[PDB]
């Protein structure tokens, strides 16, 4: 309803940025790397997840997976505070390939993919793996239920899938979790990619370039397609599981996504890990097929090494990129906020950026010094009738010492140009 804040192009914004340090634990071991953080906020409660590994920051290469439940609380500070309520380690952490958080009805829900094979997505199938829901609330002990993938229905001949993303969504009794699927046949079309007027590589044709750019980079015979999983149930009973693929309109290689409930709509985000290096996001129109109204963003990108750096546009067999959530601020003005990386090819210099689809409105660096950051996530909410946001950054400020993500809270500026 009410929305009072800066909605114009301006400089020197006052986000009133403050870092929160008491939520995420501090490990005494310097060799442990805490990586790939996830955070989902809903109805004043949050669910935080991160991975802990020994001398390696790879996600499935992790011996511990932390699951935190908490609440948003006013401390009279004129700003929202994170109150950590419960903190547990996942019972199958050393076999976790991926997890996705959902805060439903003021409680935490974690959807994880467990496998004996760290390369399960390249040489195995989902019948060989297991998928779990770990759910809990404040001080209650966590309970983990195995998802009956045998009684699962799919809209196509998928051979594998993993929960991959920064968050899911609760609608009534249904959970909607972002998922990346694997299929071993080329069932896709690429009118959007095939319409680009770019230099033709002398080797292959544009139709082949666009077909092949959807392939997995480690199994030339497999294709990674993004989608969603809809799980409806009768109070953890009589599970009904559905697997729907994303629209084939403006396809991009399988990548971690996100679903968020914001402003009465459902926003889907897909990290750009292929040739289209610009922001992939959109609101959900239909659920079958999963059709997000793709944005036409000409100003938001992400860094990456190789043939697809920041602002790269032309179709190319590319793989790589960073995950950088967005959060909508005003539906009518098409405004969004996101912690993006201000570098063409290196993952560094995070900047809080409030932007249009066509212009960047305002921005501020997170750190004055150069800061390594592999991924960011952002969630915004109403607090004291004012728009506040909390972001988590996968940081590496101490090179060689322990790695730990960072949480920042900031407010959208009420007026333009205040410093």
């Amino acid at each position: 309803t009410g929305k009072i804040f800066c909605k114009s192009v301006s400089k020197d914004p006052d986000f009133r940025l403050k870092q929160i340090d008491y939520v995420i634990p501090v490990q005494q071991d310097r060799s442990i790397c805490m990586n790939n953080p996830l955070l989902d906020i809903s109805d004043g409660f949050f669910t935080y997840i991160h991975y802990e590994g020994i001398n390696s920051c790879k996600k499935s290469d992790s011996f511990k997976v932390l699951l935190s439940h908490g609440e948003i609380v006013d401390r009279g500070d004129y700003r929202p505070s994170l109150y950590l309520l419960s903190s547990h380690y996942h019972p199958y952490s050393m076999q976790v390939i991926n997890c996705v958080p959902v805060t439903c009805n003021q409680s935490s829900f974690v959807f994880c993919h467990i496998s004996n094979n760290t390369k399960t997505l390249d040489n195995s199938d989902y019948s060989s793996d297991e998928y779990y829901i770990t759910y809990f609330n404040g001080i209650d002990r966590p309970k983990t239920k195995k998802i009956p993938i045998n009684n699962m229905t799919a809209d196509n001949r998928y051979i594998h899938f993993t929960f991959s993303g920064g968050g899911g969504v609760c609608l009534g009794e249904e959970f909607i979790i972002p998922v990346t699927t694997v299929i071993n046949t080329d069932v896709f079309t690429h009118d959007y990619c095939e319409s680009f007027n770019c230099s033709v590589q002398t080797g292959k044709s544009l139709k082949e370039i666009c077909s092949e750019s959807l392939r997995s980079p480690t199994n030339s015979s497999r294709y990674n397609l993004n989608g969603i999983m809809i799980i409806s149930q009768n109070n953890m009973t009589d599970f009904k599981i559905q697997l729907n693929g994303i629209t084939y309109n403006k396809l991009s290689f399988g990548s971690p996504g996100r679903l968020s409930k914001t402003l009465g709509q459902v926003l889907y985000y897909q990290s750009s890990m292929s040739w289209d290096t610009y922001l992939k996001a959109g609101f959900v129109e239909k659920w079958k097929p999963f059709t997000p109204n793709w944005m036409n963003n000409t100003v938001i990108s992400r860094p990456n090494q190789g043939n697809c750096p920041r602002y790269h546009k032309c179709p190319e067999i590319c793989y790589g990129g960073t995950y950088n959530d967005i959060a909508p601020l005003d539906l009518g003005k098409d405004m969004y906020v996101s912690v993006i990386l201000d570098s063409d090819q290196l993952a560094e210099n995070p900047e809080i950026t409030v932007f249009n689809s066509t212009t960047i409105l305002y921005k501020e660096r997170v750190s004055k010094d150069e800061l390594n950051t592999r991924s960011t996530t952002t969630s915004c909410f109403l607090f004291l009738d004012e728009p506040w946001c909390i972001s988590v950054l996968e940081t590496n400020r101490f090179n060689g010492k322990s790695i730990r993500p960072e949480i920042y809270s900031y407010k959208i500026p009420k007026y333009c140009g205040t410093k």
């Binding site: 790397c33 001398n55 390696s56 920051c57 790879k58 230099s199 590589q201 002398t202 080797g203 980079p217 480690t218 199994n219 030339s220 890990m273 992400r302 860094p303 990456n304 090494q305 190789g306 043939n307 750096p309 190319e316 067999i317 793989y319 790589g320 990129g321 960073t322 990386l341 063409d344 090819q345 290196l346 993952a347 560094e348 390594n372 950051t373 592999r374 996968e394 590496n396 090179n399 060689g400 790695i403």
Partner: protein, 136 residues
């Protein structure tokens, strides 16, 4: 910052026996420029693989090595910036750490016909291999 590495058969830094060794400290910048259209029109097309020392000796790659960057366009200045931080925007993580070894090669035939030749190629013929022992 460090000295960029022009990747062409006409680059002297590739020692005929020792390759190109660098001793970078953490937090250094390092570009790997693949060459523009050279004056004499000798079109140079390569495909660079992040590889292991064992497969660096044989100069062969299986499918698991990731095609780090490919030198497709002759006119456009294709490049590849590296900062030796831990977190990198590449698929498969590519943790740099310190006191490790990191080997980069290309197995490609000089032109695009053998662009994806993975058996031998420049890694042994011209020994255009970049080896990066961080530290020391």
């Amino acid at each position: 910052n460090l000295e960029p590495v022009s990747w062409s058969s006409l680059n002297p830094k590739f020692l005929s026996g020792k390759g190109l060794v660098i001793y970078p400290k953490i937090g250094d910048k390092l570009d790997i420029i693949c060459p523009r259209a050279e004056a004499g029109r000798p079109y140079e097309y390569y495909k660079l693989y992040l590889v292991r020392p064992e497969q660096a000796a044989a100069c062969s790659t299986v499918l698991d090595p990731n095609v780090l960057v490919t030198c497709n366009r002759p006119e456009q200045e294709i490049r590849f910036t590296i900062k030796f931080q831990e977190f990198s925007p590449n698929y498969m993580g590519l943790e740099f750490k310190k006191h490790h070894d990191y080997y980069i090669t290309s197995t490609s035939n000089g032109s695009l016909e053998g662009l994806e030749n993975r058996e031998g190629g420049v890694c042994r013929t011209r020994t255009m291999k970049i080896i990066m022992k961080v530290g020391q």
